[PDB]
């Protein structure tokens, strides 16, 4: 069906002027932008985001890091956006990702691997609920009949 | 200096998959993205945003059109952003636009000229106050010393 | 040797403004363009082409779809054009296509997977005779001694 | 209204690998393709096309040049295609063309200025019926209401 | 004719990842690359490069700057390289350069306008003798007959 | 850590105008340019670079080749630059090359596979020593904290 995924451009990806590039890959892919906002993640909120790892050792670092620079919060839609978004993004380790993927092309180190994507439809539904409580933008592309069906 | 300009991708700009292409253009330039959000414009809001034309005949169409689809409302900061911002977008009429400018390269008609840019710093602040009453994200690019001074 | 493959940009490819992107992919690879035409396919022809499976169920669909809009018929020459072209196009299912392939980067569904490419040297030769019974355009790229040997 | 213009990628444009670049420029602008074909030109035809200059010293030169290699004949349609097609192509002399224009960024001499478009609507119609006596392929872009009205 | 012009990507040009971008502009143009090196400028040399201004108040700043980071020194050949280089590059002040030029799309301030280009055939000759005393690379482009004659 | 790799644009890469495109990839990836020089190779020199293949029958054609056109020799730095360098370049035989790799995208035959890159780090050192005996350019990107750590 029309599932959605949460895609986030991290601090490093912003400092290195990669926003347009990332958004262009998803645009030409046929997926639909449903939500986008550029903003400074706050501590409390960041802990909320990395809550499923509050137990873990690297949690504090995660929180601290994402607070260091504004990020771009997105939500895209279409057949297999969660899984394809992951595929498009590439391996966690840049030197492991496949050429053609975002991380294989723009990243060098795991800790600065430019982007983030929901690893599942449910985690996506949860992430979307946390970042876009206000809801998303409604619209339908006039090219829909040529992308689907 | 720290001059800011309100740049917005009109609805037709979003339908034709030009979001990332436009954003890359202001990034590669060296301007800083200070605010961004993907939304659906409300009729009362559109009216205000076009207040300085309420008197003109084409007002209705202008508002009905601004609401026909979601847009990308942004704020870019940088030395002369308003002026060059307007220079980059190109003349109102596409066919009169200088080759190399956005409108000349991606548009055909005036009522569908992909994007809008503040035309004075005063109107800039007037628009920023309207679209971003909540304020702008703050950050400091590491390329700043190589872009300024 | 100098095989030729029949590459056709499907109706959706034309609507999604991907004609240039696609052709720039084959030109840059070093392949030679031998034939190219923008045309509206007629049913009898649509049927001959897909006749390889006029028996099957979905046959009707394929015929009706390739006539719903204009296409871009092309012929490309070079070493391993047939095989490499399919490699460049990517697997039938976009969601299975590898990053870097056309389908992986521009498509979402199989019904709208943007492009067709000969699947074997024989089929390639037969399609070239079907779509270009008038012959190809003979020319000698000055870049030959630099892409061959 | 939606006039049309004859756009041709000269022999040099084909050799240099610019068929893709050029097409994409026009697709991106928002013009619609109505007819395109890769082909060799016979002397007879080349003479009809430049008949208007038969009484000029440089006439032989022109005829002898369009026959040296295949070209790419195209008919593009859009508001003001002819005049903006001219502005897009750039001045006759590459060194006098405006940046952004096709000749300013891709050519060096007048004899090898890569592309050529109709200079007037009357001259366009004429070149269109001469190169495409067999007619043009009709189709309506689903993106029409976002490019016009 | 076989004119040459010294083209330099200044320190800020390297720090901003523009090397490939700039080069592609001269490559796609049809111009021939005759020399290129990535180097750190030693003070004594900078003083020699800026000698003709050795009596101006901003001389020390001009020297200090060019020493603060590596640069890419190049030599390009082609009809009207000097002046056309000046055109491609753009007006001294980025905010005054024509859209389509390097400074118009990549720079914000004059003191960091990303690149330098000889201003006259005689100056280019000096500049070349100063940075490339060791001579230039020799080659003939196969596409020569398609960009010249 | 901060390993280096010798990356060379072969003679056919220059003739084909891929210098800018290729360099832009490494810059966009986040690797650091440490050395670069457009140059003509001397026979006795080529013989030593291909020393490890002097026993083989194709050594002669191997040397006569890089000696027939100027090349661009470079040293790049970054974590895993050798491994990623090879991955980005792609299998030595273009038709086995993974989509998204420089060779899978720009090459056709082995003898004209566009680019060369260290296959191990100790060979990188062999090459850096041979081609860059005078040393490399030193500098520190301002985006360092956003690429590593």
From Swiss-Prot, chains A, B, C, D, E, F:
Subunit structure comment from the entry: Homohexamer.
Reaction catalyzed: a 2'-deoxyribonucleoside 5'-diphosphate + ATP = a 2'-deoxyribonucleoside 5'-triphosphate + ADP; a ribonucleoside 5'-diphosphate + ATP = a ribonucleoside 5'-triphosphate + ADP
UniProt KW keywords: ATP-binding, Kinase, Magnesium, Metal-binding, Nucleotide metabolism, Nucleotide-binding, Phosphoprotein, Transferase
Protein name per Swiss-Prot or TrEMBL: Nucleoside diphosphate kinase 1
Positions annotated to bind ATP: 10, 58, 86, 92, 103, 113
Free-text function comment from the UniProt entry: Major role in the synthesis of nucleoside triphosphates other than ATP. The ATP gamma phosphate is transferred to the NDP beta phosphate via a ping-pong mechanism, using a phosphorylated active-site intermediate. This NDK is microtubule-associated.
Enzyme Commission number, as recorded: 2.7.4.6
Gene Ontology BP term (one): CTP biosynthetic process
Matching InterPro entries: NDK-like_dom (IPR034907), NDK-like_dom_sf (IPR036850), Nucleoside_diP_kinase (IPR001564), Nucleoside_diP_kinase_AS (IPR023005)
